[PDB]
């Protein structure tokens, strides 16, 4: 079987998988930003 890099690249290469993963990373980064902003504002 191929190395992990080729499967990983093929995983980004698909447009539908790519858009869902960037969208999910978007909510993840937004959520951690909420966490940071209110742990700061609370202190």
């Amino acid at each position: 079987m191929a190395s992990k890099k080729e499967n990983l690249k093929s995983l980004f290469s698909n447009t539908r998988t790519r858009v869902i993963i960037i969208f999910t990373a978007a909510l993840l980064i937004i959520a951690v930003v909420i966490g940071f902003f209110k742990i700061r504002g609370a202190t």
Binding site: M1, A2, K4, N7, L8, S10, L11, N14, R16, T17, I20, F23, T24, L27, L28, I30, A31, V32, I34, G35, F36, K38, I39, A42
Partner: protein, 127 residues
């Protein structure tokens, strides 16, 4: 069916002066330490949950790398978006320092309160 407890019961107002104010479930006000402390606790759990979900992301794509199949097989790709948005939404505190998930459990607590009122009221009427 369903039944909201009588306004005069001390169970709900004791809930009110303990937890403070819960949006849409109760209107009484008390010691407002709660709202803010579980607000910050929800924010901290949000941060560590983002970390843990990123961890699960690397491990899930790593298992997918062992399989070499596109679109993934360990997870359904049509339910991940909706699932993630619902969970993230259910983990936003409001200005009251409370998520909507805690909203549904306080709703369940007051509903169990109402069930207790129902049984106890039937008993007292029988006596």
């Amino acid at each position: 069916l369903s039944f909201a407890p009588p306004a005069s019961d001390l169970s709900v107002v004791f809930l009110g002066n303990l937890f403070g104010v819960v949006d849409g479930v109760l209107h009484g006000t008390g010691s407002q330490i709660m709202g803010n402390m579980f607000g910050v606790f929800n924010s901290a759990v949000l941060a560590l949950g983002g970390i843990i979900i990123m961890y699960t992301l690397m491990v899930s794509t790593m298992n997918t790398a062992h399989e070499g199949q596109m679109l993934g097989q360990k997870w359904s790709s049509i339910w991940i978006p909706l699932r993630s948005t619902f969970g993230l939404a259910l983990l936003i505190p409001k200005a009251s320092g409370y998520c909507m998930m805690q909203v549904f459990f306080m709703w369940v607590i007051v509903q169990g309160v109402g069930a207790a009122d129902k049984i106890w009221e039937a008993a007292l009427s029988y006596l």
